[PDB]
Structure 1
Amino acid sequence: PTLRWQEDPEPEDENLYEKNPDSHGYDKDPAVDVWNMRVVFFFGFSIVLVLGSTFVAYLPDYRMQEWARREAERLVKYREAHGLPLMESNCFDPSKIQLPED
């Protein structure tokens, strides 16, 4: 014989269609919804996505990659011309060592 409440039946469902069939995602203000569609496709795709594609498609030599390609080509031709085998092992100088004796 008591209620513990005073409020409306929750919720009050409002369909976002059926007042604007020409509406996009949010509220029935017909101008700013078109403004949102325009800004999300122009300032979100048309100036961001394809420009980012052209930006990341080519840029300087990332991790000095093709620099290392041409450097390795010149170094292999250099070491083939000077008779020594390519990739001299023991990259640090074996004369430049001070071993702990035993």
Structure 2
Amino acid sequence: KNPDSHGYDKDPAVDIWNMRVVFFFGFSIVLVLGSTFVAYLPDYRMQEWARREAERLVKYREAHGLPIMESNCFDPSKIQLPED
């Protein structure tokens, strides 16, 4: 299909407008502004909260008496612990 005209999708005219509805909508609004949207999207999975909150909580335990990485059975003697 070439009657030596250019042609994009189907034919001569308003099928000419089919390029500027796929080029302009497809990328250049979605693959740019929508790609920008999740570039700086807010704190994902609440990790940015955890960064500073793990940053703070180290040196408070590290100061006086609280050890680090306990795994302390989550306040024992609330477990009755059936023997057998």
TM-score (norm 1): 0.67
Q: CA RMSD in A?
A: 2.5
Q: CA deviation at 1:28?
A: 4.6
Q: Which segments of 5 or more consecutive residues in structure 1 lack a partner in the other structure?
A: 1-18
> For residues 39 and 101 of structure 1, do their structure 2 counterparts lie closer, same or farther at Cα, with a shift above 3 Å needed?
same
Runs of 4 or more, structure 1, over 2 Å off, are 19-29
Q: CA deviation at 1:41?
A: 0.8
Q: CA deviation at 1:101?
A: 2.5
Q: Which residue of 1 aligns with 2:50?
A: 68
Q: CA deviation at 1:23?
A: 5.8
TM-score (norm 2): 0.78
Q: Quick check: which has more Rg, 1 or 2?
A: 1
Aligned equivalents of 1:85, 1:21: Cα separation in 2: 82
Aligned equivalents of 1:65, 1:23: Cα separation in 2: 56
Match of 2:63 among 81, 86, 89: 81
- Cα deviation, 1:72-95, whole Å, max 9, x if unaligned, reads 011112211232211222251122
Kept in 2, the 8 Å contact 1:27–1:33? The answer is yes
Give identity over the alignment, percent.
98
**Matched position secondary structure for 2:5:** coil
Q: Which residue of 2 aligns with 1:37?
A: 19
Kept in 1, the 8 Å contact 2:62–2:68? The answer is yes
Aligned equivalents of 1:86, 1:48: Cα separation in 2: 47
Aligned equivalents of 1:81, 1:23: Cα separation in 2: 79
